Design a protein around this ligand. Structure first.
Ligand SMILES: CC(C)(COP(=O)(O)OP(=O)(O)OC[C@H]1O[C@@H](n2cnc3c(N)ncnc32)[C@H](O)[C@@H]1OP(=O)(O)O)[C@@H](O)C(=O)NCCC(=O)NCCS
Ligand SMILES: CC(C)(COP(=O)(O)OP(=O)(O)OC[C@H]1O[C@@H](n2cnc3c(N)ncnc32)[C@H](O)[C@@H]1OP(=O)(O)O)[C@@H](O)C(=O)NCCC(=O)NCCS
Ligand SMILES: CC(C)(COP(=O)(O)OP(=O)(O)OC[C@H]1O[C@@H](n2cnc3c(N)ncnc32)[C@H](O)[C@@H]1OP(=O)(O)O)[C@@H](O)C(=O)NCCC(=O)NCCS
Ligand SMILES: CC(C)(COP(=O)(O)OP(=O)(O)OC[C@H]1O[C@@H](n2cnc3c(N)ncnc32)[C@H](O)[C@@H]1OP(=O)(O)O)[C@@H](O)C(=O)NCCC(=O)NCCS
Ligand SMILES: CC(C)(COP(=O)(O)OP(=O)(O)OC[C@H]1O[C@@H](n2cnc3c(N)ncnc32)[C@H](O)[C@@H]1OP(=O)(O)O)[C@@H](O)C(=O)NCCC(=O)NCCS
Ligand SMILES: CC(C)(COP(=O)(O)OP(=O)(O)OC[C@H]1O[C@@H](n2cnc3c(N)ncnc32)[C@H](O)[C@@H]1OP(=O)(O)O)[C@@H](O)C(=O)NCCC(=O)NCCS
Ligand SMILES: CC(C)(COP(=O)(O)OP(=O)(O)OC[C@H]1O[C@@H](n2cnc3c(N)ncnc32)[C@H](O)[C@@H]1OP(=O)(O)O)[C@@H](O)C(=O)NCCC(=O)NCCS
Ligand SMILES: CC(C)(COP(=O)(O)OP(=O)(O)OC[C@H]1O[C@@H](n2cnc3c(N)ncnc32)[C@H](O)[C@@H]1OP(=O)(O)O)[C@@H](O)C(=O)NCCC(=O)NCCS
Ligand SMILES: CC(C)(COP(=O)(O)OP(=O)(O)OC[C@H]1O[C@@H](n2cnc3c(N)ncnc32)[C@H](O)[C@@H]1OP(=O)(O)O)[C@H](O)C(=O)NCCC(=O)NCCS
Ligand SMILES: Cc1cc2nc3c(=O)[nH]c(=O)nc-3n(C[C@H](O)[C@H](O)[C@H](O)COP(=O)(O)O)c2cc1C
Ligand SMILES: Cc1cc2nc3c(=O)[nH]c(=O)nc-3n(C[C@H](O)[C@H](O)[C@H](O)COP(=O)(O)O)c2cc1C
Ligand SMILES: Cc1cc2nc3c(=O)[nH]c(=O)nc-3n(C[C@H](O)[C@H](O)[C@H](O)COP(=O)(O)O)c2cc1C
Ligand SMILES: Cc1cc2nc3c(=O)[nH]c(=O)nc-3n(C[C@H](O)[C@H](O)[C@H](O)COP(=O)(O)O)c2cc1C
Ligand SMILES: Cc1cc2nc3c(=O)[nH]c(=O)nc-3n(C[C@H](O)[C@H](O)[C@H](O)COP(=O)(O)O)c2cc1C
Ligand SMILES: Cc1cc2nc3c(=O)[nH]c(=O)nc-3n(C[C@H](O)[C@H](O)[C@H](O)COP(=O)(O)O)c2cc1C
Lengths: 67, 67, 67, 67, 67, 67, 67, 67, 67, 67, 67, 67
């Protein structure tokens, strides 16, 4: 009946984990419709002078295909 | 030489597992050419009053890239 | 806000995979309320004289906790 | 000597990841005694108009069995 | 005391998943004795014009070694 | 037909691995009926002055559900 | 801030593993901009009369999304 | 140069884990030559009136192929 | 050319996940130079009377080796 | 319909990874018919005075069963 | 607050599994302070004329870092 | 009896995979004694204008502890 597609995005943020996830989802929303669920695959990031520099949440986003 | 792409789809069906897989592949065939193989990643679904409500087969579909 | 619980069941059937899943969900329904989704963890079984004897679907069942 | 049990819960929250984990543990505390440790199995969630709608932390909770 | 061996087979069928599993077990029975249990490792297949062309169930078969 | 449930326990012992497994199964037997099989998921433990202090075997226990 | 996308390709070559990876990346470069990193997921291949016939490197390619 | 083969066996014993492993290796030694190393894949078993009934160590055994 | 080393740390914090990661990286920075990236392996923790007591992020830290 | 068997071999070579894989397949070819595909499970090896001493590619080889 | 380090050791013994684990922890204790917990990653070993020759337990050891 | 330690290194090279592994092992040899075996955990790398820029082999190196 219904068919969904999953797309793997990496959301990044210097503020936090929630912000990194939201960054990815805010970009998906600009282009994709019927965004339904997400799955966090891994949490990575870079290290700077002040500790964590950039949080990087690797993310699978599922959306319903039209037509 | 050849390069293939894999795309992750979720086929759903109220009838059965085979029907769920076929639903995903029937939607892929509308848009993609040179579909070659698939790999079932996981089997999930929803529960209703009569037991299984919707079978949901998470699926990787491999196809040959042109040019 | 909401909290769900997951419970690991193994549904068995001599007839097929769908029947094995349905057996587990039919038993869960007798006792548990607000059954929402399931996840197939593995498919196993026994072998007899006529091939497959019993299909055994190891299954995670998610339901909403009350109150 | 001692025997512990592990139970798989899914804590949900619209506010954040920490709130989702706390939701699950607050519900466990109402019913279970000698809660000791937890293990995050996966982080999932739903998508709405404003990005993340509901954070969902799938969680294993370990507690000491009495007697 | 007892020692079992596991052998990895791939059963294929154009008709369905159950038929693929049965194809592997029917071939094992021709040659091996004391076949006891099986474990499905992965589900793959090929794609044709009519959707799924051949279902391919990768399968571990366990049997008791004699003597 | 039949439906089984799996429950995740952690047996602990200062004496050894076998004693840790037996501790979990001895506690299960007090409360659960038709215990059939177990699966070791992981082996952990604590460290003291004399080496290993407590062996901790994380364990899945499968039993047949009644009625 | 930044958002990356990951795409799963399978590079193939009769010459070697490096050539298979390079095949996939050369095809990505024709169409995608800001290609940054790759991750080898698995190495497979076909067998002919002279041993290995075609090396097949399944590959995840990460690139920065524009705008 | 050298080629090794791996074979998956399941050693069982009512006495203990070490005895289960040794049961598998004692049977391998009767038939196979140049046995070099082993890898424990999982530890399972059955449950009886007195706790553990039979320990079952699933095992990969590596040996050098002749010629 | 370049060689990096990875070290596995567990950062802990009573405040949150981000604080737990930062605690680990702040300790690494005291002793190690050329810290570049991190990978979260798992998220665990302890439970107290107020829910989560201590967040524990198991973490791999990668840094470039000198000379 | 068709049934395939998978066999786990370890090909070794002092010259390189491709040579290690080819060593395994060249030995399989001597004894087995209808060799079709392979899957690299892991890459290991030994260390000597001059760096890598022996590359060791653990390999699954799939072939069609006759008759 | 607190930061722990994990180190991966392989304890070996001809006597048994418990002895292999203890061998690793006895060596760690000579050099490292505040050893707290361990995690068994895998169980391997070598094969001789009399069956198992050497048990080899690959082990992660966690200890609290000072100051 | 014997105790080994494992250390996780990432060897990099612009020339190839073998060169990346050798880079890691050549650096280990400068400082560590009784290097015995290695295990490749993952293969990653960076992308430049000419395809692959730097191969990066994440590697576990095992060596016998002295004394
Ligand atoms: C390049 C790329 C990142 C740009 O992404 P993007 O900005 O989201 O662009 P897309 O065209 O993919 O956007 C979605 C499209 O599907 C439509 N769409 C949105 N929601 C949809 C839905 N739920 N179902 C079906 N179609 C949908 C949109 O209308 C849009 O189509 P449009 O041309 O009418 O505007 C992206 O297209 C990509 O990575 N695709 C694959 C590229 C690739 O891997 N190449 C192969 C190299 S070997
Ligand atoms: C949105 C989406 C789901 C729509 O699905 P769809 O029905 O397949 O629509 P598409 O436009 O992708 O159709 C397939 C395209 O692939 C092409 N194609 C099919 N098979 C091909 C092959 N073997 N080789 C090369 N191209 C091929 C088709 O010709 C078509 O392109 P065209 O419009 O130039 O003729 C899909 O485009 C997509 O996932 N893109 C979004 C990716 C994404 O997540 N973007 C980033 C968001 S932040
Ligand atoms: C090639 C192969 C698929 C042949 O399949 P097959 O049709 O089942 O043929 P078999 O040789 O296994 O015949 C069955 C054998 O198992 C024995 N057997 C059956 N049940 C048994 C049991 N429960 N306990 C012990 N032996 C049993 C039979 O007696 C027979 O042995 P026999 O020839 O001494 O009489 C399979 O044997 C194989 O893949 N061999 C290994 C190939 C390999 O890996 N090569 C080395 C690496 S290159
Ligand atoms: C078939 C497919 C692989 C072909 O890819 P391709 O030929 O290499 O190139 P595409 O046309 O998809 O992508 C190139 C586009 O991405 C853009 N792109 C490249 N780098 C980009 C970047 N970093 N950021 C945003 N966009 C980028 C290019 O400018 C181009 O866009 P434009 O032509 O609209 O200006 C691709 O269309 C695809 O797989 N899409 C998804 C198909 C799918 O899953 N279908 C659903 C079936 S159910
Ligand atoms: C011992 C062993 C390594 C020998 O390897 P080998 O050099 O390849 O010898 P094989 O017996 O496997 O040779 C292949 C056999 O199967 C046949 N065979 C080859 N290709 C075949 C195919 N595509 N389909 C069916 N059979 C095939 C060959 O003709 C040969 O049979 P034959 O001797 O009856 O002529 C291997 O047979 C083996 O691992 N056996 C199992 C050992 C084991 O684990 N048993 C339990 C001990 S605890
Ligand atoms: C059933 C089974 C476990 C019993 O086999 P077994 O008791 O170990 O005896 P096998 O003959 O197979 O293997 C031992 C033989 O290998 C040979 N051998 C031993 N080690 C060897 C090695 N290192 N290299 C090459 N040959 C070796 C020996 O000569 C010995 O006796 P042989 O002269 O008859 O060949 C085994 O035959 C089997 O599982 N085969 C595969 C079954 C299968 O999956 N086939 C397809 C069915 S769908
Ligand atoms: C004990 C321990 C936790 C303390 O960690 P620590 O505070 O970082 O102490 P270190 O010994 O690593 O000191 C850091 C050293 O690394 C050096 N270093 C830092 N960055 C470096 C870089 N990027 N390249 C090369 N060297 C570097 C520093 O210069 C310093 O060297 P110094 O002694 O010349 O001043 C840690 O040393 C340890 O776990 N070592 C291994 C213990 C072990 O497992 N042994 C076997 C037990 S069985
Ligand atoms: C920074 C670092 C990589 C430098 O590595 P390095 O170049 O190999 O230098 P090291 O001093 O650690 O290693 C060589 C030492 O190990 C010894 N060694 C070599 N082989 C040995 C063996 N098999 N058994 C015991 N010791 C051995 C050498 O003799 C030498 O000791 P010595 O200088 O006292 O004579 C290393 O200090 C490190 O990674 N430490 C851990 C970092 C860490 O996790 N710290 C905690 C931060 S929060
Ligand atoms: C060779 C090696 C195994 C020797 O192990 P070792 O027996 O523990 O010897 P170390 O020198 O590390 O001694 C342990 C140190 O940890 C310190 N220490 C012990 N417990 C501690 C704790 N919990 N917190 C902080 N420091 C602690 C000890 O005091 C000692 O340091 P000190 O002698 O300077 O006072 C070495 O430590 C090692 O594995 N280092 C890694 C080197 C490496 O990776 N090489 C680069 C590869 S290219
Ligand atoms: C394979 C798959 C995984 C899903 N995972 C989740 C989950 O992570 N959490 C959740 O709330 N919903 C999950 N969903 C349910 C989807 O959000 C569901 O499709 C949506 O609620 C209704 O679908 P629709 O787009 O047809 O309206 C999942 C659905 C599928 C197909
Ligand atoms: C990584 C990968 C995985 C594949 N898996 C399968 C498989 O699951 N089953 C199968 O029959 N063929 C499998 N194939 C073979 C493809 O179907 C093959 O590319 C096709 O048969 C011929 O390729 P073509 O598109 O160039 O004609 C696989 C190929 C690749 C690249
Ligand atoms: C298998 C297992 C896993 C554990 N994991 C953790 C951990 O994640 N973090 C932690 O602080 N304690 C962990 N613990 C320690 C428990 O919290 C421990 O049982 C408790 O601190 C003391 O036990 P008690 O209930 O008998 O008082 C673990 C214990 C077991 C049995
Ligand atoms: C490691 C292993 C896995 C097994 N898994 C299953 C299972 O998937 N389902 C099942 O019904 N029996 C399973 N069994 C039980 C076997 O079927 C059992 O050996 C058989 O019922 C009785 O053994 P026998 O050949 O000595 O008569 C398993 C046994 C072992 C050794
Ligand atoms: C999740 C993720 C994984 C990455 N893995 C690697 C790695 O495998 N090796 C590497 O050199 N760089 C890796 N990078 C770093 C990227 O190459 C990095 O984004 C690039 O060097 C700079 O990003 P830019 O496109 O914004 O300039 C990774 C980055 C992300 C987001
Ligand atoms: C992939 C593979 C895995 C191995 N694992 C181990 C191990 O677990 N422990 C060990 O002591 N030796 C291990 N070895 C080393 C073998 O025992 C080695 O082949 C033997 O010591 C010497 O080989 P030979 O049969 O040619 O004499 C391994 C070898 C290979 C090929």
């Amino acid at each position: 009946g219904k068919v969904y597609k999953k797309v793997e995005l990496v959301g990044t943020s210097e503020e936090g984990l929630e912000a990194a996830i939201q960054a990815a989802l805010a970009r998906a929303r600009k282009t994709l419709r019927h965004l339904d669920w997400f799955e966090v695959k891994e949490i990575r990031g870079t290290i700077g002078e002040a500790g964590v520099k950039e949080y990087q949440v690797v993310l699978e986003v599922g959306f319903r295909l039209e037509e």
